[PDB]
């Protein structure tokens, strides 16, 4: 629909009743290009393009692949934050069906012989020791709904991590939080580790870095000084719901993660 | 509301069924690999169409029908079941067994009435019952208003219709094959869409027709017979073969159902009749006849048939029991093939060239991802005979273009006689009609006879024992 | 405002209907696979247009109509219907059954008046009522304003119109087929757009026309002839086939409806009247006639027809019952084919060459510097006859250029004999008019004809019983 | 202020119609599949132009008009409606029905006055009224200022104009077909832009013209004839066909409307008149004539026509009833086609070669897929005649250059006349003819008699009996 720009800053209203996830609008790449108002993210529209066809039948048969662009809506934010927020949400949406097509493509046609696709087999719909398993009738990932036909298993079929992020957009924040974002530079493990190790506060939670990085600080603080600091991880903190707000936040190694993801995390 | 038929999901006959019945929706559901599946699908849909246009709470006369088919219907049926056939006992026993097994499990289907009706008839063969009788068409004495025929070729159409109209019937229906090939006095023919072949009694030992059989021989230059012969003409006996089932028929009764548009029935009472065709699909037709009391209008004695597909009739040469003879064969051709052949029949073509071009137009290779399949439009075994017909037709049309006659005169001279040309092929293009001369005035229908009980005591005991249980 | 037609959603005839009726919006829905679907859509739209044009609260007369079609309408209709056809008893029974089935369901229409009207007529047949009567067109005694003839071919146009005029009728309408072919004295013809074929009775045994039937012969040199022929001219008997239904017709009554522009009706009273054409679509026309008392102006006795499509009439050689003869046929050609055919007709072209280009031109055309499919294709079974006609026309136009003659003179050889050149085809290009001489003065209308009833006791009893069903 | 015309929205006639009327804007709207849509659009626009030009305070006379279409008009009209045709009773009945139906609703166009005036004429069919009249153009005794003729070909022009002048008429208009083809004395012709064809009675049984009908049963030798004709010359009777309607005409009355620039009318009073052409579009012209008392200047007796598109006249050979004859025909050619054939006609060309070139130029031309020639510029049934004319014209032009002669002298042996078979008038060319410019015949065709019947009077009065 319409997009209003109050005095430089850009905010988007979600009045269209089309497909929307959480508080993010979904629209075709062609719509973005044909609008001078959305000229700030035209580069992403070109990139998401070259990935939109309407299938094919015959010797070389494929299925229609449609991509979409995700933008935040409803909140008055700076134009710069609009660019980064769209990139993070759009990438996750395009990632999920890329795997979904790959599993669906193997089912209808024959798996390649000189490849690794033999790790995916066709399994009876009754014997389903797999806790989550991919079905073909509805081309989603489902636990137990009596998938008719003959069910597929595979390596990534066991943990559906691609499917574990589609619902994450429902609770994804849109408004950036205003706070003095300071940072420590230089090769890590000199004082920045020691900031959260020897002089960390009571209410801070070590959730940053890889799961190993989350646990090392917890073992480091307890063995050296103590202070009973627990350990969550970035993946669990971002996906699962949050709790009582942290007093002071000491996230480390967040520059590996994307900026838009950090904006929603804070 | 969806109608389910026993057809394979990839059959090409499904498209033809939908265009013939645009008021329904058809979904395939196969449960048995019957050899005549296409012939039964059409019959199933025909009955559904008729019941949709018949006024409810009106009794219906069903002539020569198996009573096990009209059991679950909510209408009122009166079945006329003579016992002059070799498969009647199985139908009667099956009807009794299914009736007994259905008692007490169906709420409202008049099961109790049917049980009582069957027992009453078995006690007295001559009794009349609303839902069952053992008389014939001219012997039943039950009044109604609608009569239905289904695949009946053993009655005389004018005589049978008159007896129905006396009792007060004002509507009738007929379902069956097409009578047109028999009006042209053919020797053999085929219906390729339903896998049906028919032939004459005297050509059952041919070599290259649909229904025949022969054996190997070396050939001798001498053999004597007591029958001079010297004349090969069609007879009254014809054999039918639908799928893997044999049916003997007669030409006289088959031609009696090629009714004109308007005809009069004159006797003790007078009636005026009409005839229309409502459904036609590659050989099967459905006819509707209306009857009124009185005597109105005028008659012309003509019958009209409309061709949606090509109709061919040509002369072929074959060896019957080692002797070379010639007769005529008829068949049907799809419309798409006929339209694409218009270009090359402007010149003279040899039979070999016609056969090769027909094969190319017929067969295509279809690939679905990695699977390969061969698709055909019409049956391949009829191509050689069809290719011959086109070659002869293209030659006869050219000769008419050089020997041009004057306008409005007849050439008749050394002697006052006119020469008659030879004809070897009759070809009817799509969207073309054919007209025949038939009879329209019927006077005599008196066929008195005596009724005899067509039943046996061993059969009567078996039915009674089967219909013996506390429900 | 939308109008529904029983036509397939992918047919090519929908474009033609939209062009002929620009004041409506037509969209298709199919419920029946009728063989004459195109011929009924035109009639349905014609009645809708006529009703809109005329004002309400005006009494309308129907000449030989089915009362069941006008049951649900707002206009005041007076149905005149004698008992002279085999379909009349069926139509009356349908009208009574349908009328009694909606006694307490429809309140807007005058249902009660119609039921009482039918009963009063059934008592005594000599009663004139506002809705129903059992007289002819010259025996009814009901005064109205508008008369409608729908598909009426069995009356004399001058005599019928005069009897309507003396009762105070100012406007009339006619819906039917074009009568232009019958003024050219053709032997056979066709209307490809409506699947209609007609032929003379003397050539019903032809081989290569739309309505014929023959058999296979080997050839008999010399035949007996009790009587002598040498004459082959059209007779008064003509047979029509509209898809699948047969209709006999007469030439004299067919040609009486090709009225001139202005003519006078002078008898006991005098009137002056005109004739105009409002709608024309590939064979179907709608005519409007307005009468006025008194004598005015002068008459010229000329009739004009405007051709929006090509009209052809050629002479062909065929074989009728084994004997070679020649006669003339006529047909219609689409305008698009004619325009694209102009380039090569400047030279001499053989019939074989013309046939090949017609087949190719039937798939692709050029429009506005671009390319598309024809979408206005012609039937394939008439291409051979059309191709031959074009060749003769091209040859004849080249002999006139080589025989240049002086201006203002007419060579004559006391008697003066002049030669007549040969013509074998007549071709009327689009946007060209035909003019002919007809009669424009009629005075002899004296027909002292009595009247008699045509009903019977058995039919009267049935109608009373059907109307006895009060619920 | 847009004007709506009853034609198709994709017709090629829109471009020509808009160019002829640049003071309006034309908008299409189709409600009827009439076969003469082009002919009615021009007449509708012509009346609109005339109405706004004249003073809205004067009185207008109509000659042989239909009063039904003059109802919703803000001007003052005096309709002269005699009873001399089979169409008049229908028009009069329609006028009465419309007047009664629209009574009491539109009380702005003086409906009550018209209703009362019509009733008065019915009672006494000899009175002169401001709105209605029952005499002819000569017998009418009403004084006005402007007279309008619309599609009138049955009145002698000098006689009618003089009778209007003595009643104080100073301006006149005429709308109709072009009379140029009848000055060349042709046998048949056509107006392809309006679907109109005309022919003479002696060639009604031709084979290859626009209005004919022949037979097929033939092929014999020898037809005895009593009279020795040997003559084919045009006669008075001429038949017209517009769409699917037939109109008989006469040559003498058609040629009387080809007036010169200046002419004098002499009699009891004297006047000087001038004729001018305002609008011309492919066959229809609009002429304006002014009258002034007295005698002034001198006349020359010449008529001038300006050609915006090609005009062609040739000689053709055909068979009439089976006998081969020869006569002349005429037609019109679009300007674009004429320009593009300039280079081809430089040499001698075979008729069949010219036909192929014309077909390609007409329906097989493309530039960018936007405009082209609308893939149909000239109707296809007149190409064979046109191709024959160009071939003969080119051949005769080459012979002129091979017979070069001296300047200012002529040779007599007593001189030879060459043969001409084609007259071709290219665009931007004028033609001049000699006509009469002095008229003094004061004929008095005064035999007055009414043509109203008693039954017709009863019907008209009865329709007005009820005020609704
Ligand atoms: N020529 C001919 N064809 C028949 C006759 N009866 C049935 N048919 C056709 O044969 C086709 C297949 O027969 P079925 O439907 O199997 O017959 P059924 O009623 O199931 O019982 P059976 O005759 O014992 O097989 C039917 O569709 C009919 O069109 C007959 O009496 N004569
Ligand atoms: N030559 C001729 N054509 C007719 C006549 N009556 C109807 N037709 C045309 O043939 C077509 C056949 O009409 P149907 O589809 O059968 O419908 P119907 O006329 O209401 O009912 P029927 O009595 O069966 O004809 C009509 O649409 C007419 O255009 C007739 O009497 N003579
Ligand atoms: N040659 C000739 N053309 C006429 C005449 N009257 C009208 N026309 C032309 O015919 C064309 C078509 O109009 P018509 O179809 O006759 O209908 P109308 O003019 O609206 O009204 P009507 O005269 O009642 O038919 C008009 O544009 C006129 O230019 C006439 O008397 N003679
Ligand atoms: N006159 C009749 N009236 C009513 N039903 C009949 C009559 N004749 C036969 N039938 C029934 O129709 C069916 C045909 O019986 P038919 O004697 O023809 O058997 P058939 O010997 O196999 O010959 P066909 O193959 O031609 O049917 C039987 O079921 C029979 O009950
Ligand atoms: N003189 C008439 N006046 C009114 N209606 C008539 C007249 N003659 C016939 N009809 C009606 O024409 C309708 C059908 O035409 P007709 O009576 O000629 O039947 P037909 O013998 O089949 O000939 P056709 O093929 O021309 O219809 C009948 O319903 C009849 O009522
Ligand atoms: N002298 C006249 N004055 C006024 N109107 C006239 C005169 N003569 C004819 N008209 C009118 O011109 C119209 C054309 O009718 P006309 O007299 O020419 O006979 P027509 O044969 O019907 O037409 P036309 O001869 O032009 O083809 C009529 O309405 C007529 O009233
Ligand atoms: Zn019975
Ligand atoms: Zn009546
Ligand atoms: Zn006057």
Numbering used by the authors:
A (entry chain Y): 1 to 266
B (entry chain D), C (entry chain E): 2 to 414, 419 to 476
D (entry chain F): 2 to 414, 422 to 476
Quote the passages of the study that discuss this structure, keeping the authors' original sentences.
Alphaviruses replicate their genomes in membrane-derived ultrastructures termed spherules that contain the negative-strand (−) RNA template, likely in the form of double-stranded RNA (dsRNA) intermediate species, and the replication complex (RC) assembled from nsPs. While nsP1 + 2 + 4 forms the core RNA replicase (referred as RC core hereafter) to catalyze the essential chemical reactions during RNA polymerization, nsP3 is likely to play additional but essential roles in viral spherule formation and RNA replication inside virus-infected cells.
In the RC core, nsP2 extends toward the cytoplasmic side from the nsP1 + 4 disk. In consequence, the C12 symmetry of nsP1 is disrupted upon binding to nsP4. In addition, nsP2 is close to the tips of the hooking loops of nsP1 (chains C and D), forming a three-way interaction network between nsP1, nsP2, and nsP4.
